[PDB]
Symmetry: C3
């Protein structure tokens, strides 16, 4: 096996091309760069700049108004600074910021659902309840500015898309038993498959561990299922999930609990 | 905004005074000193002395008899030594200790419920099931002797009351984006608002992060809701809670799980 | 009390001998060596050698085929290397490996159930649903090669059996308020009582904290209850469990969640 992190064109995957290669990548590596997905440096610029500006020039009063009463980093500002958002209940410092970041979020959300749809297609997977219900989920977008820097872990998402700005290559993932560099690619977004991909496809997809080594920024978009996403308990045990679930079927909520857990 | 940790007289809050100031403090800071609440250095002395004595002169056999089979630090002795207790199922080394600490616990419990009642009043909050059912809960008292010393975090309680004995100021909380000193006050108790206050009031109360920096002792009283405390799922998502709960309403148990989690 | 880690012969415990001593050990220490249980250095050799061989000579392709898509360390290979297995859904590199490790697992499983049966007998405990249903559970076997090395914690199992290969004594447990050495014993297996023993017997059994200090190998076998193991909520609170469970009875799943948690 070649320990290279492959790259796939989204348009090409949708054309039905490179299926075997794609399947093999999902199974043995669980990560790849994605091109032609509506996400490039061009998008990352407007959002990065305006939020970076906010981090450096926003008054203490402005940041307060966009900070949640509970420091969960789910929405708004968080003091490595962070800015998070989802499909709703967002906190935006200004109209300009809102317009830019709402557009940026939608683009990120569309590419994530699209690539995930391909992950389901390539593995011939039909989630309980159907593909669409599964993909119209609970994504979370976290933009972080970093002026190890993050312990090893795998993501519990379906897929996680990451856009970075270069410094030194900080992001690293395990490939072929070794931590491999995952540098910026102004033309592509980095896709990490998470535990839910592994679970929903019956173990056809690997969820690789990764970490941040020790300025940079990272835009991390988690495509997370709904609390009611349902799956087979026996099948989960067949691919490595050490579940303590009574019964034949269970929901994401039964497994993870009442609060989203993004990494592990 | 003034980054000063304000002080409120409980008797005064009950008189209906300083309401706007109080509301503003809860919202922007989530912490304050509380005076006139039946808790002073005078109470802290008897309990501190007798437990300190126990920590320094209790035989290994005496400490065993007051140590739980599972080291959960929920009740009894724990080897920074600790002594914990609740409304029942307590472990007391002697009759004198019991009389002193039972009285100390009741005083702490009464002040916590009282201040919490005011927090609910100021925010015009009526918990599902009523105020009284909500306040007659599952508090936990932990006394620790310390011969960072405790990582940053916020409390998942409704409110947490802390009485300390000075050394250097170890306790610190984030106020205005900066960790501020929270020194002893023989005349007052320090009140931290926890995540449940934020949740029950619909985001009207902030749960500030805090930590212990690097001898001292601290008496920490967590006022925690019952497993059945119920709340609106949509409203929880509106103020920052990244919940994975199916449905419109949920209980504390659905959210946190089957074991109390005090900090996060 | 003598802070010595006692040793019990399984055959002797089954004969009904040393009952008071046994009861006292469970209550005040929660740990002991177990002899005459079908587990000696002789068994540990075949399994150790063949797996050690695999760790040092298995190709990257061979290790991949025995590695789970999700890095949960529940089954198969994990890069301190580890090899895990349970009653089913196992990943074996070869027929020889399978035959050796299946036999090794069954031996470990039989001794664990046997000693646990004695723990239940000595404390006059009858688990809800009966002894047999309780013991036919969800064990997990983890073999680790180590070329503090492991933070302090107690196990959430019923009992945990450990077989080691000496180096320096790395394994240590708290006995009498002090961390005591727990060296290899080619003739005996080390038994740690876990939280479930404490819970099911109503607090008659202690779950001691332990840790690994800073090459060696350890074969750790967790005897874990089923998701549906049921217990009394009031009784759990009586012996130290800080539960947030509504109702009179609860299952292991209600308490721990949808994913097995082995230590705490
Ligand atoms: O900052 C990065 O590049 C990675 C972040 C990451 O893995 C996460 O947030 O899970
Ligand atoms: O020791 C202190 O002063 C604070 C303790 C604390 O924050 C806690 O126990 O959550
Ligand atoms: O490696 C050892 O000897 C102990 C391991 C242990 O306590 C565990 O896996 O819980
Ligand atoms: Fe990640
Ligand atoms: Fe705290
Ligand atoms: Fe352990």
């Amino acid at each position: 096996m070649d320990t290279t992190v492959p790259t796939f064109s989204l348009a090409e995957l949708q054309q039905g091309l490179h299926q075997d290669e794609f399947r093999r990548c999902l199974r043995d590596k669980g990560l790849f760069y994605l091109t032609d997905c509506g996400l490039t440096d061009t998008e990352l610029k407007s959002a990065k700049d305006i939020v970076i500006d906010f981090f450096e020039h926003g008054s203490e009063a402005e940041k307060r108004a966009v900070t949640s009463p509970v420091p969960t980093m789910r929405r708004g500002f968080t003091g490595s600074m962070c800015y998070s958002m989802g499909t709703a209940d967002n906190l935006f410092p200004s109209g300009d910021f809102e317009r830019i970041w709402t557009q940026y979020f939608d683009r990120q959300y569309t590419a994530s659902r699209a690539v995930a749809r391909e992950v389901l297609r390539a593995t011939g997977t039909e989630p309980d309840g159907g593909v669409e219900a599964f993909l119209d989920c609970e994504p979370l977008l976290r933009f972080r500015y970093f002026p190890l820097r993050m312990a090893p872990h795998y993501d519990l998402s379906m897929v996680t898309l990451i856009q970075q700005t270069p410094c030194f290559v900080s992001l690293q993932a395990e490939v072929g038993g070794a931590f491999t560099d995952l540098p910026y690619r102004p033309d592509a977004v980095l896709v990490f498959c998470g535990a839910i991909a592994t679970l929903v496809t019956g173990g056809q997809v690997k969820a690789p561990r990764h970490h941040v080594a020790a300025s940079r920024t990272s835009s991390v978009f988690f495509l997370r299922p709904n609390a009611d996403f349902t799956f087979s308990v026996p099948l989960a045990r067949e691919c490595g999930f050490d579940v303590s679930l009574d019964g034949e079927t269970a929901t994401f909520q039964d497994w993870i609990g009442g609060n989203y857990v993004n990494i592990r």
